[PDB]
């Protein structure tokens, strides 16, 4: 029943984290070993002595020694028979309508072992990272549990492969976006297949770039490869039959990092102008909308789609303005939805790394995100709800904790800690927000744990107020009908009664102001003190 499971992964990536939660919270024992030289590999399997080895995420062969002695199951983001190291890249380039994930045995030939479990699913037209993080991740969880059942039963035999194919590593020539020859659909497919790594190569404004995060543009028209407009640092680029937005780019050099396009293109954008669209405007054609505000049934819904959940200083202020617009609206509740792939991951570490002074940009970013939290907290006459459709970590978790209610989809993974970014003290009113939910003893325990927890475990400990839904869309529906019932009851007014009283009294405003002050002083030491752990850890996070 209580198996001992050793993870071999290249990195402790999102799928490895999700599996870790699913098995850990089922009373199993999981050791994670980030694949090293095959020697530490053999030696660590010796020392740890597992019942079962999972490889959620490998980029090299497991030593024949190890898996001939321990049952070794490999995750493959393809249907049974699909072999190769870029399964999803190829599935998307080839326009596959149906795809799947396979759990197969380790063997001497790459991806040729017998199958222990698989799932199939209809393929969305979407970024690779998002297929991986939703359909692939969910399927892999089902496979592993099934294999765990088949294993503890001891009497299971895997299905040898039959029909099978090999797709080699994909070269950049196949990904290259050629603006004069490629229609919008072809550019979406190329960028989708390279998002978020390695990027689709291209030439923009004479500069050689990698493209990331593409959105079709249905209104603006021009010459293929022309930069039509700017919009919140994205650029709109003419294609063969229309236009496409690209929010993020990377120079094709070694030391450079993904940044907003306007920061990569920089001074080359002299001519082009901004083409704004408020989050509350209504628009009939497909365009790029970073933040979206929509009112349904007396509720204000704020969508914000910050690439990779990273919140730049500037994006914090765009969000704060949409919150201020909502608080002046005929709505009883205000729901922050993030995006379908992330709720939030706190400060944009890439825009911090890129700034002249990362400490100063770190100072701007933490104050801006604190200004968002403060605005949420000081909403005495309205209900506020955090809706975690996707994962969240570091400052993004505590952004959500400032809302009256925090709901999350099933499968959401949380990292309520700064153990990966140099032990930042954190802010976002966590000294107020966190103990009001779990007490100072547990809250500090939460922040000391570098391992993730599911939205399920977070609910159990009282960190959040409810988990439900299997998909983003389901979660959205159930969340709406749950908030809908509450503001249509006498409980809603008896709740604003208390909240109006406390959150306008001077003893509360000064309480929370002393919290923001105490946190920023610790964070100021983190950004400028002698101990440079935070800057060291940011450097490696951003260049991996
Ligand atoms: C939260 C976290 C544990 C999730 O782990 P995970 O499931 O393995 O997800 P990943 O790190 O692989 O995220 C995928 C992408 O999102 C990016 N990303 C996530 N959070 C980011 C952030 N705050 N800033 C910039 N980029 C971020 C990652 O760089 C990664 O980039 P890539 O796809 O180009 O390789 C992890 O992403 C993390 O440590 N983020 C940093 C958050 C932070 O410290 N913010 C500053 C304090 S508020």
Residue numbers in the entry: -1 to 542
Task: Quote from the publication.
The crystallographic analyses reveal that HypX consists of the N- and C-terminal domains that are structurally homologous to the hydrolase domain of FDH and enoyl-CoA hydratase/isomerase (ECH/ECI), respectively. The putative catalytic residues, His74, Asp80, and Asp109 in the N-terminal domain and Ty416 and Glu426 in the C-terminal domain, are perfectly conserved among HypX homologs listed in the previous report. CO produced by HypX is used as a ligand of the iron in the NiFe(CN)2(CO) center of NiFe hydrogenases.
We prepared and determined the crystal structures of variants in which mutations were introduced at amino acid residues interacting with CoA to elucidate physiological roles of these residues.
